[PDB]
Amino acid sequence: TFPIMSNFERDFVIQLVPVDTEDTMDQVAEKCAYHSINRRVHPQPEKILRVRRHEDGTLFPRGMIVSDAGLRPTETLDIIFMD
């Protein structure tokens, strides 16, 4: 259990999203989307949800787990559409 700040692509606001240290980037991306897709952002099913560190633009592999990413509690993460 671990707080992060989700800055979801094409949304207007950063939001608090609890994730698990055992989650994958993919599963972080799903936990964030819940608070954005179909509330304020349109689904993009031809696309893939990626996670990057807001501060420096570092891209996380879909499969890397939170515990290994060296995040600061409450760190702000971009949730971008890619392929």
Binding site: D11, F12, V13, R39, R40, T76
Partner: protein, 491 residues
């Protein structure tokens, strides 16, 4: 016969003396006076341009209350409030809750100058200032009190600033920083120059036009009357700034203006911005929030700052850009999280509204419009539950407002993060963060609502828990102003 004011006025402010039985620093402690190394005698050059004496004050201000209280008694039984546009009623409930007790607190900020300024002119003017905010506070309580039987929302005219509801915290955050917790000269700059002269004077003017436009003459008269009191105490910071510039302190003065203007702007972007561009019905809208800001606030600052020997703040061009953006953010956030406030936000995204919005802000429909498309489709398609939140937004650590910005086809939302002494802070803008970096000891261990949630201070640690912690219950918890009437236009 009577003397002419000019002949004896100076004697009213010839009140400085050289202490003997206690020292100057004891009588005027720096942390309260902020004399800043500048001498008693140099503080004596302070010359307020608008002069007034006690008998004039008590006489004129009796007339003002006569009138305003009379217009109120006259219109009382007609009950305009029961048939007003609900975007309007909401503008009023927001105004009172955010403002009434901060007005009253402003008399303490005035008392700060009245006791601790070294400029005798400042001490006497601040004494009238003190009386003025006493009046603003009291009358902004007597007025909404008329409505307590109509809704529990009106009780927030008194209760709001006693709560931890998030808007109240943003308010206190602003007011305490600007006027309650600074030395006298800083209050004179930060409150009277930057906030009152810079923003609330023109605001109250527009706010009065708008009430009139809504056919609310009680409130138009109320606001209009308060506004006539502003300049008598608003003038105070100007002469301070002259004295600091003329002595070795332009940078200190500059930096205080810089801070006060940014912080005021942020508050203004959530308190006035949304109500101008979305709560006011379409056919009442004279100019846009951005237009109002350029014509009535920004040229004035440049004018003022040029005359004082000061510079436009480092962030000026950014401030300019953000007039297209920030308040759309603040409105979206407030409406989306509407159960967390004590008024009913008006969505204001009907087709006619959206063309208006597109005229006034080119790009709106392709940025801001996207989120509202989705909100709209959901309401058309019977999914209202996707139009209320299940988490908190990230709060800025300086302004205590959500961190929001341009979405849609031109997404540009940023967090201006800072790590400081093992803690991570979040900022809504580059200027917000810089306010913290120039003076971190004054903000360090403050916690925003989110920090408090994260630390275990809100219990149960869920949304219903956070509602109780903010003192919100059904009956005051906000919802859509026109009860989703505008959705019919899309079906």
């Amino acid at each position: 016969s009577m003397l002419k004011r000019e002949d004896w006025y100076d004697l009213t402010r010839t009140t400085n003396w050289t202490p003997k039985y206690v020292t100057e620093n004891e009588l005027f402690p720096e942390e309260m006076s902020g004399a800043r190394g500048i001498s008693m005698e140099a503080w004596e050059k302070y010359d307020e341009p608008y002069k007034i004496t006690y008998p004039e004050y008590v006489s004129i201000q009796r007339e003002k209350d006569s009138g305003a209280y009379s217009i109120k008694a006259a219109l009382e039984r007609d009950g305009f409030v029961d048939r007003a546009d609900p975007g309007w009623v909401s503008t009023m409930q927001l105004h009172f809750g955010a403002i009434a007790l901060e007005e009253y607190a402003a008399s303490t900020a005035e008392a700060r100058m009245a006791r601790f300024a070294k400029a005798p002119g400042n001490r006497n003017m601040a004494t009238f200032g003190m009386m003025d905010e006493n009046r603003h506070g009291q009358i902004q309580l007597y007025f909404p009190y008329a409505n307590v039987k109509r809704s529990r929302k009106w009780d927030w005219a008194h209760k709001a600033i006693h709560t931890n509801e998030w808007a109240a915290i943003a308010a206190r955050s602003f007011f305490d920083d600007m006027m309650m917790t600074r030395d006298s000269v800083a209050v004179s700059i930060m409150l009277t120059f930057a906030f009152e002269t810079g923003f609330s004077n023109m605001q109250f003017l527009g706010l009065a036009a708008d009430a009139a436009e809504a056919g609310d003459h009680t409130f138009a008269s109320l606001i209009s009357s308060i506004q006539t009191d502003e300049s008598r105490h608003a003038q105070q910071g100007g002469p301070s700034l002259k004295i600091l510039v003329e002595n070795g302190k332009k940078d200190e003065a500059q930096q205080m203006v810089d801070v006060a203007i940014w912080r005021s702007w942020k508050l203004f972007s959530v308190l006035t911005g949304p109500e101008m561009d979305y709560y006011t019905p379409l056919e009442s809208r004279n100019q846009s929030f951005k237009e109002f800001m350029l014509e009535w606030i920004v040229a004035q600052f440049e004018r003022q700052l040029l005359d004082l020997g000061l510079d436009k703040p480092w962030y000026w061009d950014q401030f300019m850009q953000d007039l297209d953006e920030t308040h759309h953010g603040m409105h979206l956030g407030v409406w989306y999280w509407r159960p967390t406030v004590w008024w009913d936000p008006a969505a204001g995204v009907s087709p006619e509204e959206r063309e208006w919005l597109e005229e006034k802000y080119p790009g709106w429909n392709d940025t801001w419009g996207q989120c509202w498309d989705v909100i709209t489709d959901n309401l058309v398609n019977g999914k209202p539950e996707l139009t209320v939140p299940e988490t908190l937004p990230t709060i800025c650590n300086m302004c205590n407002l959500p961190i929001a910005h341009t979405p849609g086809n031109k997404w540009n939302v940023k967090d201006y993060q800072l790590e400081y002494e093992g803690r991570l802070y979040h900022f809504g803008s580059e200027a917000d963060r810089w306010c913290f970096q120039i003076d971190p000891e004054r903000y360090k261990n403050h916690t925003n609502l989110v920090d408090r949630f994260l630390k275990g201070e809100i219990q149960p640690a869920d949304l219903a828990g956070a509602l109780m912690y903010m003192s919100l219950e059904p009956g005051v918890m906000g919802d859509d102003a026109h009860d989703y009437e505008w959705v019919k236009a899309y079906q």
